[PDB]
Curated annotation (Swiss-Prot), chains A, B:
Portion held of the full protein: 27 to 149 of 172
Protein family: Belongs to the tombusvirus protein p19 family.
A GO BP annotation: symbiont-mediated suppression of host innate immune response
Taxonomic classification: Viruses, Riboviria, Orthornavirae, Kitrinoviricota, Tolucaviricetes
GO molecular function, one term: RNA binding
Alphabetically ordered keywords of this record: Host-virus interaction, Inhibition of host innate immune response by virus, RNA-binding, Suppressor of RNA silencing, Viral immunoevasion
Oligomer and partners: Homodimer.
Known role: Viral suppressor of RNA silencing which binds specifically to silencing RNAs (siRNAs). Acts as a molecular caliper to specifically select siRNAs based on the length of the duplex region of the RNA.
Record's keyword annotation contains RNA-binding: yes
GO CC entries: virion component
Source organism superkingdom: Viruses
Identification of the protein by name: RNA silencing suppressor p19
Length: 122, 122
RNA sequence: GGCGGCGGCGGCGGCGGCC
RNA sequence: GGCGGCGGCGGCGGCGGCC
């Protein structure tokens, strides 16, 4: 299936995750998890994120309105399907959801939600 | 139970809702729905909202960090419980969730989420 | 980080019902 | 707007298991 994502997955191995745990804390993870769900299908990413401008800029590029619409439209037809973006970072999860007819607005809110969460006060 | 909310509920009657439907469209409802959930308990509000500054200011006052913490803390103890804010307006729902230890951060994201959604481009 | 399992609570979407 | 019902998909939180 074609992904809504434009960067590949970066899930740490169990060993990398242990090492990072040994050397740091839920407020300083390796990165964050995000997902786009259209109908019955879900696409997932773990992306490394270090709370700098360069890093925020990188991870904001993991999907766009267009990449999302291209992916989701594979699943469209007459009836409306449920669409969901979810992001989790530092113990907070934000999910943005609605029906496919409102996908443009869900993307707009999803991107703002992502930026606000990834810049939230330490 | 003590509510996290500081404004009373404004749910339209079935007749008011029909009349409003006859005279207007999912992009122009009477208002929006919001909820705060702590453990097993959920508190809900429908609030009238007309997309003006005065109205946005009013409905942003429906809860605060303090009102939320006072309400939620009734349900606290040793073990962490799940906390959730949900808001729905114009076909988009945003839910902010995490555990009670992170309640301050959930509130910060919940208030931003509320403002962004209620000001979203028509 | 990932994958099962057992409780609990939310959310979206479809279909219909009562009001 | 509210309340049932029947599919589907997600989220949080608790408890434990494998890795």
């Amino acid at each position: 299936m074609t992904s809504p994502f434009k960067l590949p997955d970066e899930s740490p191995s169990w060993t990398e995750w242990r090492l990072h745990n040994d050397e740091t804390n839920q407020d300083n993870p390796l990165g964050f998890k995000e997902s786009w769900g259209f109908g019955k299908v879900v696409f997932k990413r773990y992306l490394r994120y270090d709370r700098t401008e360069a890093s925020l800029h990188r991870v904001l590029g993991s999907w766009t309105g267009d990449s999302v619409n291209y992916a989701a439209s594979r699943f469209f037809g007459f009836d409306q399907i449920g669409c969901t973006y979810s992001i989790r970072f530092r113990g907070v999860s934000i999910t943005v959801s609605g029906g496919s007819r409102t996908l443009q607005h869900l993307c707009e809110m999803a991107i703002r939600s992502k930026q606000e969460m990834l810049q939230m006060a330490p």
